[model samples]
Target: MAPTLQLPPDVQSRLNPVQLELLNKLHLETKLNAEYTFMLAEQSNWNYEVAIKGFQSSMNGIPREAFVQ
Candidate 1:
């Protein structure tokens, strides 16, 4: 299992201040889940469903689906 923060000596060594700050803020806020969604988009080959799901899952509650025209 990923140890909650996964911040051991070697792991901590690899993280600079910005990474550490992001980790700290993530610990403080569930809304940080949005950043994960965006990061996923940046790293993955995205489809409509993937993009929409990320929109639905983010901190702001955007309308998730469209009605037939």
Candidate 2:
């Protein structure tokens, strides 16, 4: 397993509950999971299920334009 991960202090406070939950789950899945996914999820208004789906694609080597959609 990889080390624990987190969002940046400057931006972490901005995440809503859903985003925070997603971020936490992503980190738990793989410490290698990108922080960028958190940003993408936030940008997508915390539609975490979709964000996580994309993150899963990236981790599994499925083609994708970004860490999350």
Candidate 3:
């Protein structure tokens, strides 16, 4: 079984609902660690499509399924 994701307390307490959803989506769908994924989301202005593409580019040569798990 996959473990529950660990996120920072500030993020846990401070995010608005939309931001929280984005964080959950990013965590579930990418191979990126928490910090990098959060930074990517922020870097892309919370745009999921943009962050996903960025993740794909940065994680080039890795399979999509790798991210899903």
Measured by lDDT, the strongest candidate is 3
| Candidate 1 minimal-lDDT segment of 10 residues | 60-69
Clashing pairs in 3: none
Root-mean-square deviation of candidate 1:
11.4
TM-score of 2: 0.46
**Reference-based lDDT, residue 5, model 2:** 41
Encode model 3's per-residue lDDT on 1-69: one tens digit a residue.
111256756656766778878877887777555666677788778899998888777776544544443
Q: Residue-wise lDDT of candidate 2 within 26-69, one digit each (tens)?
A: 55553434555555565546665666666566665633443342
Q: What's the ranking of the predictions by lDDT, best on top? A: 3, 2, 1
Rank all candidate structures by their TM-score, best first, as comma-separated numbers: 3, 2, 1
Local accuracy of candidate 1 as per-residue lDDT tens digits, 34-56 = 33432443333433345445545
Compute the lDDT of residue 1 as modeled in candidate 2. 22
Model 3 misplaced stretches (Cα beyond 4 Å)? 1-5, 12-14, 60-69
State the local distance difference test value for candidate 2: 0.53
Best-performing candidate as measured by TM-score: 3
**lDDT value, residue 11 of candidate 1:** 57
- What is the TM-score of each predicted model, taking all chains together? 0.37, 0.46, 0.64
